[PDB]
Amino acid sequence: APAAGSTLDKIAKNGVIVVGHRESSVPFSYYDNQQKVVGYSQDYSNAIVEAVKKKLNKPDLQVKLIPITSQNRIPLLQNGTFDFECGSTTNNVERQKQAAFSDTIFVVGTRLLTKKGGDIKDFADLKGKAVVVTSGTTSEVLLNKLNEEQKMNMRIISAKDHGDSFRTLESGRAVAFMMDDALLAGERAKAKKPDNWDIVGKPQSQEAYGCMLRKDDPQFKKLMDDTIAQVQTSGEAEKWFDKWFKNPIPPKNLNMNFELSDEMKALFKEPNDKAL
Amino acid sequence: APAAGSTLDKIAKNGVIVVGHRESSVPFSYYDNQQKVVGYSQDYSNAIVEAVKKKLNKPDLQVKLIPITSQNRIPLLQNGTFDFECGSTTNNVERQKQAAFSDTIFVVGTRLLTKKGGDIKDFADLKGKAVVVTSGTTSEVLLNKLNEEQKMNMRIISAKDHGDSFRTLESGRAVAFMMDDALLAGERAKAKKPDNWDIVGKPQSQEAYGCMLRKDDPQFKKLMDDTIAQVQTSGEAEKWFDKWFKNPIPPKNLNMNFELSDEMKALFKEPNDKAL
Ligand SMILES: N[C@@H](CCC(=O)O)C(=O)O
Numbered sequence A, B: 001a002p003a004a005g006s007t008l009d010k011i012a013k014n015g016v017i018v019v020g021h022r023e024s025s026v027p028f029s030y031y032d033n034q035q036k037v038v039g040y041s042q043d044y045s046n047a048i049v050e051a052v053k054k055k056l057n058k059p060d061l062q063v064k065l066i067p068i069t070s071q072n073r074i075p076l077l078q079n080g081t082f083d084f085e086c087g088s089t090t091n092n093v094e095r096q097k098q099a100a101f102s103d104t105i106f107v108v109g110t111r112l113l114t115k116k117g118g119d120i121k122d123f124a125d126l127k128g129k130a131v132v133v134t135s136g137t138t139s140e141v142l143l144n145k146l147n148e149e150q151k152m153n154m155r156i157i158s159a160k161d162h163g164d165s166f167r168t169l170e171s172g173r174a175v176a177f178m179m180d181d182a183l184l185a186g187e188r189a190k191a192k193k194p195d196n197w198d199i200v201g202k203p204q205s206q207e208a209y210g211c212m213l214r215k216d217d218p219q220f221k222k223l224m225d226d227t228i229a230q231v232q233t234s235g236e237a238e239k240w241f242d243k244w245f246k247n248p249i250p251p252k253n254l255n256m257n258f259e260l261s262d263e264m265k266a267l268f269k270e271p272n273d274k275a276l
């Protein structure tokens, strides 16, 4: 039976499960401009909601969707503004001090988006340039560290979400946008002219996405992990991958044209929740 | 503007304010058996709810009542199961490490309820006796300490709420109930034979009640304290006192017959939030 102060207890007492989600983490958790929140990560959220309804024996449980940002997600989690989110949040040791993470749902590398035919091909080319990054991200930490340690004299623009960052780039307010490679591709899949944008640079990190939930709630983490493990080991996660990464997606019917990583091939066979 | 991770932000983002309340803290926050949650403390909760609706310019804001207990209130608070509660929670330094408290709304002393016809006149008379206390309370802490340090050989029965404690006493399962004096009087007011029961003993503590809210949320504490201050300094709090403590109350139409202390009168003129 759920313990006082656990998430299943909160949900049962409120009669609501509150699902945090992203607005612009494409193709993970984002708005389709068809009145829904969709994507590869959001498909896990939907599965988790069904598992909660089943566990609590409450099929008419209200489901509330609450938008969150990379900057605000931990504060909102910790006061119960939302109960869990599946999007584009990196599981790392630092964040484990504040939150818990499910089994890994995706793996990314941090790279650059830049205009084609410009002069940015590697991180070193950013010296003395304006560079945009989304506030509250691992890329913002990495980029500020690079700026200091490698003395690059970058002017770092911190934007509120990934589409704001992309539009900074698109409007010529920055020469490159640093982010998780998949998210860069996702922003390009919404662009005016997708052709105009290239992903370049050696990755500065390799990072695991997990669904995020409150710390010290083993029962809820187990529900989430068990749900993820069924999706992944049954072959369903790979079908979700193909849908969101190899086929036309909203809102512009463009294709990511990605291929499934070796890292996720191994995780779909034996799910785990380790930070990289 | 409410910061991310604050209670006003949570309320706005969820479209609801969740008010924790008691079931058996008489005459503070309790069920009237007329389909309402009522009492002297709950009157402050209603005032705070109105202040929230005004501050957020949300006149139709949903209000959800959630029952809590002495044992589960801090776990439930910390994961956002509820946003605030006004009842019978003591503000003390230890709990300030986990929660915040409003300006004080009442002051109690921890005493004993026992058969008027019986042998229990002070705490020392409890040696070798069965004594009931409500789980998760300051009285439970005090009573276990007294048992150990004074080697009293009491058999301590820990019941889930104040009415369960009283009914333990009434049914002959314990010789006395230790609790806040006002709460003892409130349970007596519901008894089969109220006249059978006496409040005895030297108080083991003097304790201040506050409404409880999350820690590190100055703006919500300020809204609550501002609301309380107006009620108290205008004379309304004493009218609420008279209503709940000097006139017949539900559910049995009996009277507490209490008098407002000079200390409370002094607080009502200049509100403050200090633990005793
Ligand atoms: N995965 C990165 C960037 C993407 C994001 O936050 O959406 C992070 O968790 O900081």
Ligand SMILES: N[C@@H](CCC(=O)O)C(=O)O
Pocket (backbone or CB within 6 Å): B025, B070, B088, B089, B090, B091, B136, B137, B138, B139, B180, B183, B207
């Ligand atoms: N005021 C005490 C006892 C009453 C109660 O919890 O309701 C406490 O906060 O522990």
